[model samples]
Target: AEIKQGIREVILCKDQDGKIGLRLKSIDNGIFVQLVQANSPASLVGLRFGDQVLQINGENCAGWSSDKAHKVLKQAFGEKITMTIRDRPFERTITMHKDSTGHVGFIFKNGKITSIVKDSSAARNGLLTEHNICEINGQNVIGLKDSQIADILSTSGTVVTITIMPAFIFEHIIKRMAPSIMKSLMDHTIPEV
Candidate 1:
């Protein structure tokens, strides 16, 4: 029963840090590892890919069922849930406050990108990427990493120009603004070659 329930939880990992997430995969009988999206409490806590969750609170979740874990999460929904996770060889115990809304990333199925980062202001206003920035400000940004976005946004008043390929559909619209798009995003507003 626990095994079945745990599998179910993995299949339908709910938003715990008050932000929705795109569930990519899960351990056969372990915790549900979620991808931290922008505006997610998990991301706010600096959770990232390859991070492994160990336990929820003091509950020995070595084999807790998804329903059971869900119930515990729901009950502890509004409170801080202390969790232990194995970040590689190191074990980290963190206290995360429950965010009812949960951070939801743009996703369709288990491992699909449902929400594409559309044209940001840099694209429209300045010379930013004409599509979702695969890399931003040289930090290797993918999707909407809020903190990074915030950092880049802070320089909004200033202009940042780069030449990136147009959307797959708009490949013909090359250089509507320039000769070519930059390979990646950068804070420097230097003109293109």
Candidate 2:
């Protein structure tokens, strides 16, 4: 329940005609229609984000919130459902599917090139700064986040081909720097607010 509560929101969107658009927002245990593109079934039906659905195919929807409503929609896809939208009403059937069979991951932050620690083979082999991490070996990085890569790096290995964007000359004159600001502080140190 704690992890579930932390999930904040679940959104669905349409990726068609190379024009992806937001569809719904499930927040605060409720559903809001954030986007309904023109000529789409949602638009044709008169469904809008703020319009709370009083019922879905005769099932009472008020107080039945975000996750609950999402499950209902997922199960009822291709099944007609009635929706009440701010005093206006309409009915429509929805269908959903995958953009691809492969898993798509998201990286919330951008990354930069940095030193790979001293006495490492990478350092001896001439891996330098400004060399953007393009790939590991021949595989393309999907998320660019460290979950999988960190797991691999946690252990020592050989023949690890780390591709990077080479650094140029005269970059940031100060060569040596403190490892990281976060590392300078204790993890549990709570400052007075």
Model 2 bad stretches (over 4 Å):
1-22, 26-30, 77-79, 87-193
Q: Cα lDDT of model 1 overall? A: 0.35
Tens-place lDDT digits, model 1, residues 12-131: 223655433322223445554333344444444434333455666656666655456556656654445565655421111111121233321122221112352234332233332233
Candidate 1 runs further than 4 Å off: 1-25, 65-68, 88-193
lDDT of 2 by residue, 96-144 (tens): 1112322112121233345444544444555555544333433223223
The Cα local distance difference test for each model comes to 0.35, 0.36
Clashes of each: 14, 4
Q: In TM-score terms, which candidate is top?
A: 1
How big is the positional error of residue 63 in model 1, measured in Å on the Cα after superposition? 2.3
TM-score to native of every candidate shown: 0.34, 0.30
With a 3 Å backbone cut-off (N, CA, C), the pairs that clash in candidate 2 are 29-66, 30-66, 33-49, 131-165
Q: Which candidate leads the pack in lDDT?
A: 2
Candidate 1: deviation at residue 146, Å? Answer: 21
Could you give the C-alpha RMSD of every candidate to the true structure, in order shown?
18.2, 21.0
